[model samples]
Target: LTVKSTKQWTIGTDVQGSERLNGVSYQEDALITYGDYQYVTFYETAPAGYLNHFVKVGRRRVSPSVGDWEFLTLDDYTQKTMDGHNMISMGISGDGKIHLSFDHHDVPINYRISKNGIAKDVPSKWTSDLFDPVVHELVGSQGPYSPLTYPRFEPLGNGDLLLEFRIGQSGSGDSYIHRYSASTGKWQAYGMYIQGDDNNAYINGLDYLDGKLYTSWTVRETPNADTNHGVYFAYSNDDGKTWFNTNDTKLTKPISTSDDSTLIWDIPQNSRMVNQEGQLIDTKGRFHILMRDLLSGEHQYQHYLRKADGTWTKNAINPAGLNGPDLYDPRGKLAGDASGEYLFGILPDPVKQSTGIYVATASKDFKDWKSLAEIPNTSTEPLFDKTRLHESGILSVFVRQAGGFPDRKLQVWDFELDL
Candidate 1:
């Protein structure tokens, strides 16, 4: 794919309501893809007036582009209900099931979306039977702590999956690789290991690369009596079972705050920081990471690339003050080869105080970056952000807009790569 700058794009007011919360009140996530047609899943908290405080899942399509997003009621999937405060993380599996991770008081509330679009809890075979006793026993001896919230699963090639997670009560965390055994009709867990600590250890992102699982986290440490915090990486060669600690293998040195050239690690105190969210191993075998630097009392985006020789380079997409407190969710899609072309999303700029969607694409070498398109009025009037763009053979972007508000909706776009 050749990289080209996009002409002024039209912003469609496809869905509207006050359901999405503005500024500090909004909280939500989104996923987009092109299966048979454009499909989007918008996850948000239900409004206050509802009888039961639960989160609502809204579904919609772009073919008819102009109408209220059809809300997919949870009652259709499982009898088990939801409470508003629980954190929900969802992803589409290779088999076409929508995998959901519901954080219930720190335990992973797992569920799967049936072919009929109903959300069903993950069968005991995948969890309690395969991992319960082991995880329970470990937690009991490790201090009877709660399990981590926001567990994410990624599919592997041979009917297997990699599960990345954090220790809920403690900052320490680990990742697991489970194989689906047809004979038992269950996911067998293996390759379990831990990373980081309460103060210096935390994981926020995970991805599979070249037959290994890679993760990102914030490391809080002190040097010369001054507090320092920055992002770090860990990898597992044997799936997610065992990991290589940076200190032990010395694979890469941690970027310290003491050096001026290394100031990228010197983020502000208030912002909610995380390593790479959406990652891609380009066609060339190089790694591209879209990291969210939510500093500046607002949201900021940064891009990093790892070469085959182990060298890492970083760049900023939006300069300081380019957006607002809510412009953070970022995902990278390879347009062609690893270094060929790519697409990314800019959540609504709360700093710009705008309620809309913005997208940009660049070359594999990061030579030419162009603004591709924008979605206008598709979000709540307030700040709607955290947009996720997923690509199969086509382009699709998902935005969690109007979160925590009555009009909270999940918006989808089936866009073309102008390049």
Candidate 2:
């Protein structure tokens, strides 16, 4: 498959800082598609600036050459910190409402949701009135919402949305899932899905395939990235209700770091392993994980797969001819369609102080690796609409182009692919 067509849109600008730290593209769910409309969320600068303070949401048609977009800025939703880990994640519920969680890095929860039927029914019109008032909890007034980080959303096809975030501090945090039921118009908590001992599970990605919810992560013993070790895996066939290991062993609530049955690879600490890399479940019911770890004392992109038959394999995908290649934070993000799996991230040239978005392609079977050409005019961490790529062969990459500090331009670059 090759890029059939390319298109981009100027969504707006955002605060700029330390390369991948506070820019728009640093966000995981900066761009997404539901039905015929595409939605985007980013932390924009205000009348003043302390970096990524304001929350802005934009919506536009999914068809090419739409040219214009409608936007809304939530009221009184300013961020308290400048940490890049507090990126905003937005998803569309099956009931056609937009749900957002943001500005959270071991701080109080910040969340907002739109009125029912706004996203799907009113695609042409958008206004601040479309959303309800911002709240500080996951849903209603249920507590245990503060001191959370790494919020993510995954929507089901049947009008339900699943949300996950770490409830405690980095080293001791536990990840939990909360499901929103459209039929009842309420949210239900699924307790701790990935537990921790003294260390927490930094999930690579949370995804739902044909009939199961898949997640993989590394255990970080401390606040340092050097403490990250071990590749663990688990899934739930009943939508976060029950989890299982590769051998289909029923895991207890909140699968822990000591759970040997869930451990896939025994990686050691001080290896410079990065957390929250990337993972995807392909159409053929296989798990594909992309991460950065030390190999023979050199950091390399490690591609892993859990095949259909429950066996595992790994590959080190390093950029060609770089003197000791070292990938940066939020290194690799994964996306795929019927054609193949795509790994997108910033390839750093530390000596030259340059970075570009690179794409690596691998078949559904996780055999062979081919590096494709660099995406034009990209200079920040790569984020894309994974849901769109899975439903359609179009890979919509969200790029933050640096024009100068508090004013970087955010664009969505689309590439059509043929399987």
Model number with the top lDDT: 2
TM-score of structure candidate 1: 0.62
Q: What tens digits encode model 2's per-residue C-alpha lDDT throughout 1-419?
A: 56678777777775656534333332546788877777888767776665536788888776553446777877566665756677888877878888888777787777788876676676456777778877776663255776788778887768788888888887898877888887776888887778789999888877887779898889988887788888999989999989999889999886877788888987888766778877877666778787766666776767788877778988776556432335354354666676446544334333333334445555434444444434544455667787677667777777666456535677777777655
Question: Which 10 successive residues of model 2 have the least lDDT summed?
Answer: 348-357
The top-ranked prediction according to TM-score is 2
Please give the distance, in angstroms, between residue 389's alpha carbon in candidate 1 and its true position after superposition.
7.9
Shift of residue 240 alpha carbon in model 2, Å:
0.8
Give candidate 2 regions above 4 Å deviation: 18-28, 64-67, 319-330, 339-367, 376-379
